[PDB]
């Protein structure tokens, strides 16, 4: 019996460009709750969203969002 | 003598000594395999789908370790080679080999070499590279030479033990920066020395913040 | 009256007590049978209870986010505070130079350590992870961890093994002569060799007799100041918690005092059938339980004393927590344990001052009866009840058991009465030797006058 | 009182082969336990 398995660990075939791996990236999009959309800043962990914050330069989201935005 | 033989007594003295000598054992024979190189797969070079050289590539052939884990100073993962870092000498360093077919079968396919993890942690540990090798922990007080190995194996067990080593002496391992350096760097004799000064001179901090348990793991 | 009924003889003695072991085990009596048979059955409910909580978690029990502890830890209690009042028959009694501990502390001893093995599972068992139940001990590791040790759960770990332990010890040497005696009565060949090993050929001798009641009075005075700290410690892991009917002063005294009225109910409840079934009237006499009633009877004011000591500390003190556990104990969702609580362990104690009650076998089995189920429900009423209702009210919540609760609970009654039904089966229930010495003294005092 | 085996050529070796027993049983769990990582 052996402390843990294998954990076979899979690179790119062509890395993506502008980012170190392991560091999270934070792009800037818009979510709407009636149409009306808020600016979100949603970080991009390893190219896929995980956290949705708010983006500080935008109308309706002075640094913050509401929760629907935030369980987008 | 009624109900016992006469080495009733000599049995029965070495049967209590003999069951003070298994606990004794037993309790050795679980803290060596709890420590035991099978177990934490120490010292055993685990095959790679394509058996990559680090022997070959970095004492002989001569890359930087930067140039295939390009991410060892920025992030807390250094970054695992794509398959386009081959790629870059191998379509024309002797490709249509055998030893490459994997390599070729991705960059054609997307699919990934399935590479296999040599140093394991149990991922709510958080190992941070970039802070290591840029407050002058270099590669092979971690690693060992792995310059010189065909088939890397992991040289420790990597325990609270090892860590918290560091974590409370770190004057013992600190360098005078070169983390990236190859493995030809050896500890002077003046370790005491150099590593306090270089221990007050990078901002490593007391052992009461680093062997803090939200240090690691989180 | 009489601690012992005259009529009796060495041989007597030895011919009465010695022959309930050592019986054919095909000869074994059938109400014998019957009891096991229950056991072993609330014993597979115990193993259906304890598969359950490990496949799924401690989450199948009915403790919620206020009740961090609900019914795991007061059958804990409990259990572990049986144990009490059968270690002060086995070393407090020996300590005092008591009569009446003569033909009980076998029994008393034996409970005990099966109070203990009930008990010393819950520890394990309401973690939810219980397979790192060894990281509470100091063991030498690879991480270079240590336990807290200003835990009281750190405290429980080393009290409940040196409790375990030393009752375990008590009863080895309380155990070897008359595994002396029942080596020496066995009269099948093999079974001599299995008694013999037990007794490790005892040759009870002068220059042994010495060392004998050397180390066993020695052992009852290590004894007993241990059992008394080792209750106020699993007092203690409420004692030192800073919720307000937690932090009390009195609750090592008083848990320790609950304990052996818990544990001489206890003691009541499984040795009346002990005294009736098997035929042992003449070595436990009535005056035997009229003492056991008075020593409960004793412990039974302590503790009542302690409930007007939660009251006194609620009523005198102007803080709003202490008031608002008076009357969420009084007129709460869960009040109707407190209510229970001063009925059972309070209102029907005080029949025991009187003689003719004290005497009375059936009023006293039913009394004792009342005695556990109010000690237990005491437990509850300073635990769940404290735990309901807390500093801030959004973090306010009933506690209501599951069935796995009271099937973890059944089961370690299975668990309990298999091992006392194996230890009435192979070993003695009244010490054959000390019974022997106790009719020396009692015929000594009759000689003296 | 003495024990039974104060007066025995037994009770030289044996005690000493105690003490030989926590020496090297002791000292085991001490290079295990420390020195063996
Ligand atoms: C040039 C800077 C290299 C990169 C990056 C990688 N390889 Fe290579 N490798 C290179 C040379 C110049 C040599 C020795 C000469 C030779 O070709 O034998 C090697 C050796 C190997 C080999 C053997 C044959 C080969 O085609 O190169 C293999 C199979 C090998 N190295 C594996 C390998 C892998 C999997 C790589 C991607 C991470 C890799 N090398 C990168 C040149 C370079
Ligand atoms: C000696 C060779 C070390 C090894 C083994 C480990 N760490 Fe370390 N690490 C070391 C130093 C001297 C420092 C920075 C000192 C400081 O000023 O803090 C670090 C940095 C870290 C950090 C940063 C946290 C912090 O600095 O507050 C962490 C969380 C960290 N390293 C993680 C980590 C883990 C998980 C390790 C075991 C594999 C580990 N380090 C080993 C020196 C050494
Ligand atoms: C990095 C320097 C760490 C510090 C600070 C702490 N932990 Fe750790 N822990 C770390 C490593 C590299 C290991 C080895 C993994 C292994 O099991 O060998 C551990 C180990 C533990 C474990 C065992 C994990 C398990 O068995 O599930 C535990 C429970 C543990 N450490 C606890 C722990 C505590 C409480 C810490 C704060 C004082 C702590 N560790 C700090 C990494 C590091
Ligand atoms: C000290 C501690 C070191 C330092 C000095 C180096 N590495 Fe890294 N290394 C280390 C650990 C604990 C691990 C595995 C990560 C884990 O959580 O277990 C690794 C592994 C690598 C990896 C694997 C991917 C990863 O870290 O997540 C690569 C790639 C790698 N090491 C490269 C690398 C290089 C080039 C180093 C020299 C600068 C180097 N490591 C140093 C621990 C340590
Ligand atoms: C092609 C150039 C190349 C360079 C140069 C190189 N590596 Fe690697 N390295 C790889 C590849 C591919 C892997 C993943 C395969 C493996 O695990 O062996 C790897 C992974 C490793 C691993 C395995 C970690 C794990 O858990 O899988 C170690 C150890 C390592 N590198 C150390 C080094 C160090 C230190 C250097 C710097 C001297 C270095 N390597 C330089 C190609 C390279």
Redesign the pocket.
Known sequence: CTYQPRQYIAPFDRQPEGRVPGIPQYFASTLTLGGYGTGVLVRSNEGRPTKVEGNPRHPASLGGTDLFAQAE | AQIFPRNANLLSRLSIFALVLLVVEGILILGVYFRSNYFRQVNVAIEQPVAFSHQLHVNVVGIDCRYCHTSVDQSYFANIPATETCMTCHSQIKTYSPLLEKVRESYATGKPIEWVKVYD?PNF????HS??VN?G?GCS??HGQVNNMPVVWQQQA?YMG??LN??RN?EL??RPREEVYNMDYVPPSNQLEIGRQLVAEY???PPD??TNCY??HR | EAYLLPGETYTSISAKIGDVPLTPPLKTPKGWLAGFSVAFFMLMIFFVSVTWLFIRGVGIWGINIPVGWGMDIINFVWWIGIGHAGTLISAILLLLNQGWRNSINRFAEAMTLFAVACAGLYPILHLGRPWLFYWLIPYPNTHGMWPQFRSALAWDVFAISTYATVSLVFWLVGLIPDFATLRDRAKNIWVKRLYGIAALGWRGSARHWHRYEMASILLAGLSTPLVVSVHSIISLDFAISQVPGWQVTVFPPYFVAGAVFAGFAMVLLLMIPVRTFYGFENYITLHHLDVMAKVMLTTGMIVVYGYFMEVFASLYSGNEFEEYLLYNRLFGPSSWAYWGLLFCNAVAIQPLWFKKVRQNIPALLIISLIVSVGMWLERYVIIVISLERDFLPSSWDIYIPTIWDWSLYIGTFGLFFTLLFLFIRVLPMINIFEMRLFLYQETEKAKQR | MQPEWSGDPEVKPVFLAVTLTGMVAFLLMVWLFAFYW
């Open positions: 942690l540990v958080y190992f941070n802070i290591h407050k922990i007080t971690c990597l090892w860590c560091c974590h770190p391992y600190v901002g490593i901090m913040q680093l240090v690691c």
